[PDB]
């Protein structure tokens, strides 16, 4: 990092076991990530598993999927940005 | 708008405490984007000099309207998520 | 495997821009584009080069910054023009 203030995407986080298992399933090989990296790999995961609705691709169905255990819900919308960050932060520990 | 919206483009209707704060810095509307809320909130802290002179990420808000929104005597603007949490609890998203 | 954005691009500022960046307390030779913008903003603010009434107008005649722009003034509102000045004054670490 550097002298310049960090933005939220630069925040270093340690994902909890379920989120870490999701991240490693798409090839990530570390225990500490930036929030940008979590969002990047989470997008790869949803794409690879094709969890989005074919017609309304902002709706993600996660029932019967690891992601559904992370969210605690059977589906979510990508349009609700801060609800997705809320799910992510509940599944990690921000590094001091 | 056709192209997907980002979080800063979210249209919001601030609740009364936050609306009073926003309007005190000259903003004269009831519907804002999240970018405007951040902008006018930043202006409010800066104009009222609520930040600590030595550690300018620390904002003191005991005895200020901002303290009624945050529910804490002081906060750090390095904890981005916690400021967004406070903001969303003080508005209704136009969804 | 994660591609860099423009703000994350590493650059090697040329001598004049490097002197400017180092004058505000930056102590290195390699920067991200985000850091270049940050320290350039700090330089304009510390030397109060902006027009007090129209604060997007920056005056830089008889200054290191005017040597960079090749002009006595510029407006912050013209984003691409400012990037063009910056890129002419650095080498991208590609």
């Amino acid at each position: 990092m550097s002298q310049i203030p960090a933005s939220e995407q630069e925040t270093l986080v340690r994902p909890k076991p379920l989120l870490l298992k999701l991240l490693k399933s798409v090839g990530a090989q570390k225990d500490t990530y930036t929030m940008k990296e979590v969002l990047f790999y989470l997008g790869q995961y949803i794409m690879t598993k094709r969890l989005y609705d074919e017609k309304q691709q902002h709706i993600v169905y996660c029932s019967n999927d690891l992601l559904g255990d992370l969210f605690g819900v059977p589906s979510f919308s990508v349009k609700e940005h801060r609800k997705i960050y809320t799910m992510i932060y509940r599944n990690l520990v921000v590094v001091n | 708008s056709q192209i997907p919206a980002s979080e800063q483009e979210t249209l919001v209707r601030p609740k009364p405490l936050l609306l009073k704060l926003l309007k005190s810095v000259g903003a004269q509307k009831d519907t804002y984007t999240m970018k405007e809320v951040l902008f006018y909130l930043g202006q409010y802290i800066m104009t009222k000099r609520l930040y600590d002179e030595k550690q300018q990420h620390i904002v003191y808000c005991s005895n200020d309207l901002l303290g009624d929104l945050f529910g804490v005597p002081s906060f750090s603007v390095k904890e981005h998520r916690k400021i967004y949490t406070m903001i969303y609890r003080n508005l209704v998203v136009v969804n | 495997q994660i591609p860099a954005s423009e703000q994350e691009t590493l650059v090697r500022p040329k001598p004049l821009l490097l002197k400017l960046l180092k004058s505000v307390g930056a102590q290195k030779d390699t920067y991200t584009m985000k850091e270049v913008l940050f320290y350039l903003g700090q330089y304009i603010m510390t030397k109060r080069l902006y027009d007090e009434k129209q604060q997007h107008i920056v005056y830089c005649s008889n200054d290191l910054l005017g040597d960079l722009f090749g002009v006595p003034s510029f407006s912050v509102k013209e984003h691409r023009k400012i990037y063009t000045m910056i890129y002419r004054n650095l080498v991208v670490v590609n």
């Binding site: 203030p5 960090a6 | 800063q8 951040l38 930043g42 990420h57 603007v77 | -």
Partner: peptide, 11 residues
Amino acid sequence: TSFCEYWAXXP
């Protein structure tokens, strides 16, 4: 680092 710099690093 200024308050404004901290604030710009969440608009």
